[PDB]
Amino acid sequence: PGPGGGPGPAALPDQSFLWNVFQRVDKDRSGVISDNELQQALSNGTWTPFNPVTVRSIISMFDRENKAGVNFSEFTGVWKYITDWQNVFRTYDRDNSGMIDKNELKQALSGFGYRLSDQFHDILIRKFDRQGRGQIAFDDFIQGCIVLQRLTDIFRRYDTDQDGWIQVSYEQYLSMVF
Amino acid sequence: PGPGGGPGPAALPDQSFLWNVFQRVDKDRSGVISDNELQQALSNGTWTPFNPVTVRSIISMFDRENKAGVNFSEFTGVWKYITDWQNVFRTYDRDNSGMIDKNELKQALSGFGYRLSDQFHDILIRKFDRQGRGQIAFDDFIQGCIVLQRLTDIFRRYDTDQDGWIQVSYEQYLSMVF
Ligand SMILES: [Ca+2]
Ligand SMILES: [Ca+2]
Ligand SMILES: [Ca+2]
Ligand SMILES: [Ca+2]
Ligand SMILES: [Ca+2]
Ligand SMILES: [Ca+2]
Ligand SMILES: [Ca+2]
Ligand SMILES: [Ca+2]
């Protein structure tokens, strides 16, 4: 009872719709949406710029030809990815506040397959809650979840017997923490 | 009104569950699930081996270190991917027959954002319906959809103005058809 089960949060509009959207986000009309243009399109709902770190992660996830951006085709992937996350967010934002608190966060993660202690959720919030109020906004929710799934993979490469425990040498410790 | 809008069909069980599943599919206990072991685990519901071509596509989609297979971590990705597809399948298998007919297929694709003529769905079925009855099984549904999304990307790389039309030279024609 330790690790983090199945993955997480990742298609109804036609191409024209999404092509028109693409054209708007792509302000310089360069043909490619950059970290900066995407950010201005996204909304964390807290009136602050969408967590740039998350935008980066989202960009390099759908950008194939390392071009620090995405083209139309890949964008529809970004569109879907952001959309699936919003649905996840609203599902667990139970008191309809627009922010995910600790109780909701435990529900989100439990629902993703994670089996983490209560204490850990305080750490998780403090770590990714930029707002600094114990209420996680949309963008910090994605990032925290990406980092969890991104670190759970690494852990699994090491936990050969997937028992939730591993023995590491000082270096490996740093190497994997790096 | 031509192309194929947003993408398509791609996390509740804990790691232990999926680790135990992994161990069963991984019969040779090699630590890696191969195209062959996955196939035996999957079910197209028609009592025939799961479309090997689809299994391959699914394998190389989650296999990072080109090892003709997937490890535990990546498998949870395969698990989720197969699961999301089953849900899509059941959503559009409206008469609850276990197979997707033409009317259901039009609904599936329309729901994915595609705007294709009726005639095209006959072609699509004939092309991917191995059973050969006009009823598309789960595995042939995934493959057909993968190929559509896989070919729609390519088309979009060419249709600069995303108008649903392109001018191609004989070679490009073959090159992109190759
Ligand atoms: Ca641009
Ligand atoms: Ca809330
Ligand atoms: Ca609600
Ligand atoms: Ca271990
Ligand atoms: Ca094996
Ligand atoms: Ca049916
Ligand atoms: Ca049904
Ligand atoms: Ca064109």
mmCIF file of C-alpha atoms and ligand atoms in Angstrom:
data_model
loop_
_atom_site.group_PDB
_atom_site.id
_atom_site.type_symbol
_atom_site.label_atom_id
_atom_site.label_comp_id
_atom_site.label_asym_id
_atom_site.label_seq_id
_atom_site.Cartn_x
_atom_site.Cartn_y
_atom_site.Cartn_z
ATOM 1 C CA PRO A 1 0.000 0.000 0.000
ATOM 2 C CA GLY A 2 2.325 2.763 -1.159
ATOM 3 C CA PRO A 3 2.986 3.722 -4.858
ATOM 4 C CA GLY A 4 0.609 5.395 -7.287
ATOM 5 C CA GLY A 5 -1.596 3.055 -9.349
ATOM 6 C CA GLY A 6 -2.790 3.924 -12.851
ATOM 7 C CA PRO A 7 -1.892 7.201 -14.652
ATOM 8 C CA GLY A 8 -4.176 10.226 -14.743
ATOM 9 C CA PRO A 9 -5.923 13.020 -16.805
ATOM 10 C CA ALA A 10 -4.680 12.243 -20.366
ATOM 11 C CA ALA A 11 -12.500 15.428 -28.668
ATOM 12 C CA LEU A 12 -15.809 16.877 -29.826
ATOM 13 C CA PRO A 13 -15.016 20.089 -31.812
ATOM 14 C CA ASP A 14 -14.261 20.043 -35.528
ATOM 15 C CA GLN A 15 -10.958 21.112 -37.096
ATOM 16 C CA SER A 16 -12.212 24.520 -38.154
ATOM 17 C CA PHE A 17 -13.099 25.387 -34.554
ATOM 18 C CA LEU A 18 -9.688 24.355 -33.281
ATOM 19 C CA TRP A 19 -7.930 25.882 -36.304
ATOM 20 C CA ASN A 20 -9.566 29.240 -35.537
ATOM 21 C CA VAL A 21 -8.549 28.811 -31.922
ATOM 22 C CA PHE A 22 -5.008 27.957 -33.032
ATOM 23 C CA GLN A 23 -4.849 31.111 -35.150
ATOM 24 C CA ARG A 24 -5.785 33.286 -32.144
ATOM 25 C CA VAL A 25 -3.291 31.803 -29.729
ATOM 26 C CA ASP A 26 -0.664 32.047 -32.471
ATOM 27 C CA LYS A 27 -0.506 35.848 -32.295
ATOM 28 C CA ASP A 28 2.719 36.356 -34.233
ATOM 29 C CA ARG A 29 1.196 34.061 -36.869
ATOM 30 C CA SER A 30 4.542 32.250 -36.920
ATOM 31 C CA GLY A 31 2.691 29.007 -37.524
ATOM 32 C CA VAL A 32 3.878 27.735 -34.159
ATOM 33 C CA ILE A 33 2.451 28.317 -30.676
ATOM 34 C CA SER A 34 5.182 29.049 -28.140
ATOM 35 C CA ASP A 35 5.327 28.676 -24.377
ATOM 36 C CA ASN A 36 4.533 32.361 -24.178
ATOM 37 C CA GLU A 37 1.520 32.397 -26.483
ATOM 38 C CA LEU A 38 -0.030 29.315 -24.903
ATOM 39 C CA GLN A 39 0.280 30.855 -21.424
ATOM 40 C CA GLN A 40 -1.805 33.867 -22.468
ATOM 41 C CA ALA A 41 -4.479 31.463 -23.708
ATOM 42 C CA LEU A 42 -4.617 29.309 -20.611
ATOM 43 C CA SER A 43 -6.387 30.265 -17.416
ATOM 44 C CA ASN A 44 -5.674 29.144 -13.863
ATOM 45 C CA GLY A 45 -8.716 31.139 -12.808
ATOM 46 C CA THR A 46 -6.795 33.057 -10.119
ATOM 47 C CA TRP A 47 -6.052 36.099 -12.247
ATOM 48 C CA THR A 48 -2.339 35.339 -12.325
ATOM 49 C CA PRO A 49 -0.215 34.124 -15.243
ATOM 50 C CA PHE A 50 -0.626 30.389 -15.842
ATOM 51 C CA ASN A 51 2.222 28.577 -14.103
ATOM 52 C CA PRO A 52 4.997 28.967 -16.765
ATOM 53 C CA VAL A 53 6.618 25.721 -15.605
ATOM 54 C CA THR A 54 3.426 23.821 -16.386
ATOM 55 C CA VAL A 55 3.124 25.518 -19.732
ATOM 56 C CA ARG A 56 6.640 24.344 -20.509
ATOM 57 C CA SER A 57 5.857 20.762 -19.545
ATOM 58 C CA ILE A 58 2.718 20.832 -21.655
ATOM 59 C CA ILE A 59 4.647 22.257 -24.584
ATOM 60 C CA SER A 60 7.464 19.706 -24.649
ATOM 61 C CA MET A 61 4.914 16.925 -24.201
ATOM 62 C CA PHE A 62 3.216 17.681 -27.514
ATOM 63 C CA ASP A 63 6.133 19.242 -29.339
ATOM 64 C CA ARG A 64 7.796 16.458 -31.316
ATOM 65 C CA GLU A 65 10.374 18.279 -33.421
ATOM 66 C CA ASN A 66 12.090 20.054 -30.492
ATOM 67 C CA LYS A 67 10.980 23.507 -31.678
ATOM 68 C CA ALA A 68 10.015 25.038 -28.328
ATOM 69 C CA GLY A 69 6.380 25.078 -29.425
ATOM 70 C CA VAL A 70 3.598 23.140 -31.141
ATOM 71 C CA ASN A 71 1.960 23.250 -34.559
ATOM 72 C CA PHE A 72 -1.736 22.956 -35.336
ATOM 73 C CA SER A 73 -1.884 19.169 -35.287
ATOM 74 C CA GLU A 74 -0.015 18.877 -31.991
ATOM 75 C CA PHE A 75 -2.086 21.732 -30.610
ATOM 76 C CA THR A 76 -5.296 19.756 -30.920
ATOM 77 C CA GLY A 77 -3.428 17.377 -28.635
ATOM 78 C CA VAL A 78 -2.706 20.208 -26.236
ATOM 79 C CA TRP A 79 -6.358 21.296 -26.479
ATOM 80 C CA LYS A 80 -7.569 17.805 -25.543
ATOM 81 C CA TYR A 81 -4.962 17.503 -22.786
ATOM 82 C CA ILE A 82 -6.028 20.801 -21.158
ATOM 83 C CA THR A 83 -9.668 19.900 -21.585
ATOM 84 C CA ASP A 84 -9.325 16.495 -19.905
ATOM 85 C CA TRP A 85 -7.538 18.185 -16.990
ATOM 86 C CA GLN A 86 -10.291 20.781 -16.516
ATOM 87 C CA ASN A 87 -12.826 17.975 -16.250
ATOM 88 C CA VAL A 88 -10.692 16.215 -13.675
ATOM 89 C CA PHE A 89 -10.323 19.485 -11.762
ATOM 90 C CA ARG A 90 -14.063 20.187 -11.689
ATOM 91 C CA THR A 91 -14.813 16.621 -10.674
ATOM 92 C CA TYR A 92 -12.735 16.937 -7.533
ATOM 93 C CA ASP A 93 -13.383 20.627 -6.849
ATOM 94 C CA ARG A 94 -16.420 19.480 -4.845
ATOM 95 C CA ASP A 95 -17.360 22.628 -2.989
ATOM 96 C CA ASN A 96 -17.215 24.424 -6.327
ATOM 97 C CA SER A 97 -14.682 26.973 -5.118
ATOM 98 C CA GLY A 98 -12.389 26.906 -8.149
ATOM 99 C CA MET A 99 -9.503 25.709 -5.990
ATOM 100 C CA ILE A 100 -8.562 22.228 -4.753
ATOM 101 C CA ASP A 101 -8.125 21.982 -0.989
ATOM 102 C CA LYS A 102 -6.484 19.156 0.955
ATOM 103 C CA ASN A 103 -9.616 17.042 1.328
ATOM 104 C CA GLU A 104 -10.365 17.412 -2.382
ATOM 105 C CA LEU A 105 -6.722 16.696 -3.222
ATOM 106 C CA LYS A 106 -6.842 13.467 -1.233
ATOM 107 C CA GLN A 107 -9.897 12.542 -3.259
ATOM 108 C CA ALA A 108 -8.218 13.414 -6.544
ATOM 109 C CA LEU A 109 -5.120 11.352 -5.793
ATOM 110 C CA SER A 110 -7.055 8.497 -4.248
ATOM 111 C CA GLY A 111 -9.105 8.530 -7.448
ATOM 112 C CA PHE A 112 -5.901 8.364 -9.519
ATOM 113 C CA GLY A 113 -4.824 5.211 -7.720
ATOM 114 C CA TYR A 114 -2.391 6.744 -5.206
ATOM 115 C CA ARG A 115 -2.374 5.473 -1.616
ATOM 116 C CA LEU A 116 -0.676 8.290 0.300
ATOM 117 C CA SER A 117 -0.875 9.251 3.962
ATOM 118 C CA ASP A 118 -2.671 12.399 5.095
ATOM 119 C CA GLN A 119 0.521 14.208 6.166
ATOM 120 C CA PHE A 120 1.885 13.925 2.622
ATOM 121 C CA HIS A 121 -0.909 16.070 1.188
ATOM 122 C CA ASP A 122 0.247 19.018 3.314
ATOM 123 C CA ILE A 123 3.694 18.662 1.781
ATOM 124 C CA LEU A 124 2.236 18.366 -1.699
ATOM 125 C CA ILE A 125 0.193 21.560 -1.311
ATOM 126 C CA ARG A 126 2.921 23.620 0.331
ATOM 127 C CA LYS A 127 5.189 22.474 -2.496
ATOM 128 C CA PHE A 128 2.957 23.313 -5.477
ATOM 129 C CA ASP A 129 0.491 25.857 -4.103
ATOM 130 C CA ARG A 130 1.995 29.104 -5.385
ATOM 131 C CA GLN A 131 -0.998 31.188 -4.250
ATOM 132 C CA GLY A 132 0.071 30.209 -0.732
ATOM 133 C CA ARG A 133 -3.346 29.726 0.873
ATOM 134 C CA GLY A 134 -3.820 25.956 0.982
ATOM 135 C CA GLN A 135 -6.041 26.170 -2.079
ATOM 136 C CA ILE A 136 -4.454 24.703 -5.209
ATOM 137 C CA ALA A 137 -5.310 26.448 -8.474
ATOM 138 C CA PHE A 138 -5.815 24.625 -11.764
ATOM 139 C CA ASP A 139 -2.283 25.176 -13.073
ATOM 140 C CA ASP A 140 -0.565 24.129 -9.848
ATOM 141 C CA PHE A 141 -2.784 21.038 -9.729
ATOM 142 C CA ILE A 142 -1.596 19.876 -13.138
ATOM 143 C CA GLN A 143 2.068 20.499 -12.278
ATOM 144 C CA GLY A 144 1.883 18.740 -8.959
ATOM 145 C CA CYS A 145 0.246 15.759 -10.667
ATOM 146 C CA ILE A 146 2.747 15.749 -13.499
ATOM 147 C CA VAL A 147 5.615 15.747 -11.028
ATOM 148 C CA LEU A 148 4.016 12.902 -9.070
ATOM 149 C CA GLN A 149 3.502 10.730 -12.139
ATOM 150 C CA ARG A 150 6.945 11.785 -13.396
ATOM 151 C CA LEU A 151 8.596 10.737 -10.122
ATOM 152 C CA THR A 152 6.485 7.597 -9.705
ATOM 153 C CA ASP A 153 7.815 6.332 -13.024
ATOM 154 C CA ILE A 154 11.411 6.823 -11.890
ATOM 155 C CA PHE A 155 10.674 5.122 -8.575
ATOM 156 C CA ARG A 156 9.155 2.152 -10.431
ATOM 157 C CA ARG A 157 12.288 1.745 -12.554
ATOM 158 C CA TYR A 158 14.061 1.125 -9.277
ATOM 159 C CA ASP A 159 11.491 -0.808 -7.256
ATOM 160 C CA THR A 160 11.995 -4.037 -9.167
ATOM 161 C CA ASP A 161 9.603 -5.936 -6.870
ATOM 162 C CA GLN A 162 7.235 -2.940 -6.874
ATOM 163 C CA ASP A 163 6.856 -3.380 -3.102
ATOM 164 C CA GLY A 164 6.913 0.344 -2.400
ATOM 165 C CA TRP A 165 10.441 0.163 -0.965
ATOM 166 C CA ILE A 166 13.927 0.557 -2.391
ATOM 167 C CA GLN A 167 17.517 0.610 -1.190
ATOM 168 C CA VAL A 168 19.579 3.403 -2.646
ATOM 169 C CA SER A 169 23.195 4.493 -2.424
ATOM 170 C CA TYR A 170 23.967 8.136 -1.670
ATOM 171 C CA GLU A 171 24.691 8.826 -5.350
ATOM 172 C CA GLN A 172 21.660 7.055 -6.808
ATOM 173 C CA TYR A 173 19.770 9.050 -4.234
ATOM 174 C CA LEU A 174 21.145 12.297 -5.712
ATOM 175 C CA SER A 175 21.241 10.981 -9.278
ATOM 176 C CA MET A 176 17.565 10.086 -9.217
ATOM 177 C CA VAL A 177 16.749 13.271 -7.290
ATOM 178 C CA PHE A 178 18.563 15.065 -10.109
ATOM 179 C CA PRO B 1 -16.041 21.043 -43.457
ATOM 180 C CA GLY B 2 -13.565 18.241 -44.090
ATOM 181 C CA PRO B 3 -10.657 17.251 -41.723
ATOM 182 C CA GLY B 4 -10.886 15.600 -38.321
ATOM 183 C CA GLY B 5 -11.167 17.961 -35.331
ATOM 184 C CA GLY B 6 -9.788 17.090 -31.899
ATOM 185 C CA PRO B 7 -7.978 13.791 -31.108
ATOM 186 C CA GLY B 8 -9.688 10.799 -29.527
ATOM 187 C CA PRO B 9 -9.698 8.020 -26.809
ATOM 188 C CA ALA B 10 -6.414 8.759 -24.937
ATOM 189 C CA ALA B 11 -6.930 5.643 -13.524
ATOM 190 C CA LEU B 12 -8.693 4.237 -10.473
ATOM 191 C CA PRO B 13 -6.841 1.003 -9.475
ATOM 192 C CA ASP B 14 -3.835 1.018 -7.162
ATOM 193 C CA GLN B 15 -0.329 -0.109 -8.136
ATOM 194 C CA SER B 16 -0.632 -3.503 -6.496
ATOM 195 C CA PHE B 17 -3.674 -4.337 -8.630
ATOM 196 C CA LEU B 18 -1.916 -3.349 -11.832
ATOM 197 C CA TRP B 19 1.370 -4.918 -10.691
ATOM 198 C CA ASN B 20 -0.417 -8.247 -10.181
ATOM 199 C CA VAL B 21 -2.011 -7.813 -13.580
ATOM 200 C CA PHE B 22 1.404 -7.017 -15.066
ATOM 201 C CA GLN B 23 2.865 -10.185 -13.553
ATOM 202 C CA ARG B 24 0.157 -12.330 -15.199
ATOM 203 C CA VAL B 25 0.481 -10.871 -18.665
ATOM 204 C CA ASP B 26 4.258 -11.168 -18.313
ATOM 205 C CA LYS B 27 4.207 -14.970 -18.529
ATOM 206 C CA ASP B 28 7.904 -15.535 -19.174
ATOM 207 C CA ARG B 29 8.514 -13.233 -16.197
ATOM 208 C CA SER B 30 11.102 -11.471 -18.361
ATOM 209 C CA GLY B 31 10.147 -8.204 -16.710
ATOM 210 C CA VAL B 32 8.858 -6.932 -20.036
ATOM 211 C CA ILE B 33 5.490 -7.474 -21.730
ATOM 212 C CA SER B 34 5.881 -8.232 -25.431
ATOM 213 C CA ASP B 35 3.531 -7.841 -28.371
ATOM 214 C CA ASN B 36 2.747 -11.512 -27.982
ATOM 215 C CA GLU B 37 1.980 -11.517 -24.266
ATOM 216 C CA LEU B 38 -0.180 -8.404 -24.461
ATOM 217 C CA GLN B 39 -2.247 -9.929 -27.285
ATOM 218 C CA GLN B 40 -3.183 -12.916 -25.114
ATOM 219 C CA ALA B 41 -4.356 -10.480 -22.439
ATOM 220 C CA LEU B 42 -6.458 -8.308 -24.700
ATOM 221 C CA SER B 43 -9.901 -9.220 -25.949
ATOM 222 C CA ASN B 44 -11.673 -8.089 -29.107
ATOM 223 C CA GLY B 45 -14.692 -10.034 -27.900
ATOM 224 C CA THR B 46 -15.030 -11.965 -31.180
ATOM 225 C CA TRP B 47 -13.119 -15.030 -30.042
ATOM 226 C CA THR B 48 -10.252 -14.325 -32.420
ATOM 227 C CA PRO B 49 -6.719 -13.157 -31.612
ATOM 228 C CA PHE B 50 -6.582 -9.419 -30.912
ATOM 229 C CA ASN B 51 -5.543 -7.640 -34.100
ATOM 230 C CA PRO B 52 -1.708 -8.085 -33.906
ATOM 231 C CA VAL B 53 -1.196 -4.857 -35.861
ATOM 232 C CA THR B 54 -3.068 -2.914 -33.190
ATOM 233 C CA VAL B 55 -1.130 -4.625 -30.455
ATOM 234 C CA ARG B 56 2.053 -3.507 -32.177
ATOM 235 C CA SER B 57 0.883 0.091 -32.413
ATOM 236 C CA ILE B 58 -0.107 0.056 -28.762
ATOM 237 C CA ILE B 59 3.248 -1.413 -27.805
ATOM 238 C CA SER B 60 5.456 1.095 -29.615
ATOM 239 C CA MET B 61 3.276 3.916 -28.298
ATOM 240 C CA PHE B 62 4.152 3.167 -24.678
ATOM 241 C CA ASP B 63 7.529 1.553 -25.202
ATOM 242 C CA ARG B 64 10.121 4.301 -24.813
ATOM 243 C CA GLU B 65 13.421 2.431 -24.901
ATOM 244 C CA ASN B 66 12.773 0.647 -28.229
ATOM 245 C CA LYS B 67 12.660 -2.796 -26.587
ATOM 246 C CA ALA B 68 9.714 -4.293 -28.477
ATOM 247 C CA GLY B 69 7.686 -4.287 -25.267
ATOM 248 C CA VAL B 70 6.738 -2.317 -22.159
ATOM 249 C CA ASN B 71 7.737 -2.422 -18.502
ATOM 250 C CA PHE B 72 5.458 -2.077 -15.496
ATOM 251 C CA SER B 73 5.370 1.711 -15.457
ATOM 252 C CA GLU B 74 4.627 1.994 -19.173
ATOM 253 C CA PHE B 75 2.116 -0.823 -18.844
ATOM 254 C CA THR B 76 -0.077 1.198 -16.518
ATOM 255 C CA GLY B 77 -0.128 3.562 -19.482
ATOM 256 C CA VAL B 78 -1.195 0.734 -21.751
ATOM 257 C CA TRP B 79 -3.811 -0.302 -19.169
ATOM 258 C CA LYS B 80 -5.288 3.212 -19.102
ATOM 259 C CA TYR B 81 -5.120 3.490 -22.894
ATOM 260 C CA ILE B 82 -7.039 0.218 -23.409
ATOM 261 C CA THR B 83 -9.496 1.170 -20.707
ATOM 262 C CA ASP B 84 -10.289 4.578 -22.219
ATOM 263 C CA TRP B 85 -10.873 2.878 -25.583
ATOM 264 C CA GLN B 86 -13.301 0.326 -24.124
ATOM 265 C CA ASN B 87 -15.349 3.170 -22.679
ATOM 266 C CA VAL B 88 -15.398 4.912 -26.032
ATOM 267 C CA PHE B 89 -16.420 1.648 -27.701
ATOM 268 C CA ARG B 90 -19.304 1.001 -25.303
ATOM 269 C CA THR B 91 -20.482 4.583 -25.599
ATOM 270 C CA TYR B 92 -20.975 4.254 -29.331
ATOM 271 C CA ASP B 93 -21.966 0.578 -29.403
ATOM 272 C CA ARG B 94 -25.557 1.781 -28.935
ATOM 273 C CA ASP B 95 -27.529 -1.344 -29.704
ATOM 274 C CA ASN B 96 -25.260 -3.160 -27.266
ATOM 275 C CA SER B 97 -24.175 -5.739 -29.825
ATOM 276 C CA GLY B 98 -20.457 -5.723 -29.038
ATOM 277 C CA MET B 99 -19.673 -4.556 -32.566
ATOM 278 C CA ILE B 100 -19.721 -1.082 -34.136
ATOM 279 C CA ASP B 101 -21.853 -0.822 -37.268
ATOM 280 C CA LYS B 102 -21.845 1.991 -39.827
ATOM 281 C CA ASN B 103 -24.425 4.152 -38.069
ATOM 282 C CA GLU B 104 -22.565 3.773 -34.772
ATOM 283 C CA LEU B 105 -19.253 4.431 -36.528
ATOM 284 C CA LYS B 106 -20.600 7.672 -37.970
ATOM 285 C CA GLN B 107 -21.566 8.631 -34.443
ATOM 286 C CA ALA B 108 -18.158 7.716 -33.056
ATOM 287 C CA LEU B 109 -16.281 9.736 -35.664
ATOM 288 C CA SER B 110 -18.712 12.628 -35.580
ATOM 289 C CA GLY B 111 -18.165 12.607 -31.819
ATOM 290 C CA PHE B 112 -14.385 12.715 -32.354
ATOM 291 C CA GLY B 113 -14.704 15.862 -34.436
ATOM 292 C CA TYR B 114 -14.536 14.307 -37.921
ATOM 293 C CA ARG B 115 -16.855 15.597 -40.651
ATOM 294 C CA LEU B 116 -16.869 12.766 -43.196
ATOM 295 C CA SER B 117 -19.432 11.829 -45.827
ATOM 296 C CA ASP B 118 -21.578 8.713 -45.490
ATOM 297 C CA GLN B 119 -19.895 6.864 -48.379
ATOM 298 C CA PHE B 120 -16.539 7.106 -46.597
ATOM 299 C CA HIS B 121 -17.742 4.995 -43.672
ATOM 300 C CA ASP B 122 -18.304 2.042 -46.019
ATOM 301 C CA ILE B 123 -14.690 2.339 -47.120
ATOM 302 C CA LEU B 124 -13.508 2.638 -43.538
ATOM 303 C CA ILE B 125 -15.353 -0.524 -42.475
ATOM 304 C CA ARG B 126 -14.397 -2.615 -45.492
ATOM 305 C CA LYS B 127 -10.815 -1.518 -44.848
ATOM 306 C CA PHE B 128 -10.562 -2.340 -41.129
ATOM 307 C CA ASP B 129 -13.361 -4.840 -40.537
ATOM 308 C CA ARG B 130 -11.433 -8.116 -40.536
ATOM 309 C CA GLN B 131 -14.468 -10.149 -39.422
ATOM 310 C CA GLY B 132 -15.950 -9.167 -42.785
ATOM 311 C CA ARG B 133 -19.576 -8.625 -41.762
ATOM 312 C CA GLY B 134 -19.950 -4.848 -41.555
ATOM 313 C CA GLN B 135 -19.626 -5.046 -37.786
ATOM 314 C CA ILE B 136 -16.355 -3.620 -36.469
ATOM 315 C CA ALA B 137 -14.889 -5.370 -33.432
ATOM 316 C CA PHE B 138 -13.089 -3.558 -30.625
ATOM 317 C CA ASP B 139 -9.571 -4.167 -31.947
ATOM 318 C CA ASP B 140 -10.370 -3.128 -35.514
ATOM 319 C CA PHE B 141 -12.079 -0.005 -34.167
ATOM 320 C CA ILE B 142 -8.932 1.121 -32.376
ATOM 321 C CA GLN B 143 -6.737 0.449 -35.423
ATOM 322 C CA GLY B 144 -9.025 2.229 -37.819
ATOM 323 C CA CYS B 145 -9.099 5.224 -35.473
ATOM 324 C CA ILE B 146 -5.353 5.182 -34.971
ATOM 325 C CA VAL B 147 -4.805 5.155 -38.717
ATOM 326 C CA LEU B 148 -7.255 8.034 -39.165
ATOM 327 C CA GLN B 149 -5.600 10.197 -36.521
ATOM 328 C CA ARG B 150 -2.192 9.085 -37.821
ATOM 329 C CA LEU B 151 -3.074 10.126 -41.382
ATOM 330 C CA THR B 152 -4.895 13.299 -40.331
ATOM 331 C CA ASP B 153 -1.698 14.526 -38.701
ATOM 332 C CA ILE B 154 0.268 13.989 -41.911
ATOM 333 C CA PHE B 155 -2.435 15.719 -43.943
ATOM 334 C CA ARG B 156 -2.323 18.700 -41.561
ATOM 335 C CA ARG B 157 1.440 19.050 -42.011
ATOM 336 C CA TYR B 158 0.642 19.661 -45.653
ATOM 337 C CA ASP B 159 -2.595 21.643 -45.507
ATOM 338 C CA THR B 160 -0.915 24.854 -44.411
ATOM 339 C CA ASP B 161 -4.199 26.800 -44.590
ATOM 340 C CA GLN B 162 -6.029 23.839 -43.019
ATOM 341 C CA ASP B 163 -8.780 24.305 -45.623
ATOM 342 C CA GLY B 164 -9.251 20.585 -46.171
ATOM 343 C CA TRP B 165 -7.523 20.722 -49.567
ATOM 344 C CA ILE B 166 -3.962 20.269 -50.770
ATOM 345 C CA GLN B 167 -2.037 20.170 -54.030
ATOM 346 C CA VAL B 168 0.433 17.339 -54.265
ATOM 347 C CA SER B 169 3.004 16.197 -56.796
ATOM 348 C CA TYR B 170 3.040 12.548 -57.851
ATOM 349 C CA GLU B 171 5.988 11.827 -55.541
ATOM 350 C CA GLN B 172 4.678 13.634 -52.463
ATOM 351 C CA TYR B 173 1.535 11.681 -53.159
ATOM 352 C CA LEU B 174 3.495 8.406 -52.925
ATOM 353 C CA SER B 175 5.923 9.701 -50.301
ATOM 354 C CA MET B 176 3.118 10.650 -47.944
ATOM 355 C CA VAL B 177 1.193 7.488 -48.848
ATOM 356 C CA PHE B 178 4.384 5.653 -47.896
HETATM 357 CA CA CA C 1 3.444 31.978 -32.893
HETATM 358 CA CA CA C 2 -12.664 23.253 -3.788
HETATM 359 CA CA CA C 3 -19.125 20.675 -9.139
HETATM 360 CA CA CA C 4 11.718 -3.149 -3.541
HETATM 361 CA CA CA C 5 7.638 -11.162 -20.685
HETATM 362 CA CA CA C 6 -23.467 -2.042 -32.173
HETATM 363 CA CA CA C 7 -24.806 0.601 -23.911
HETATM 364 CA CA CA C 8 -4.823 24.001 -48.476
#
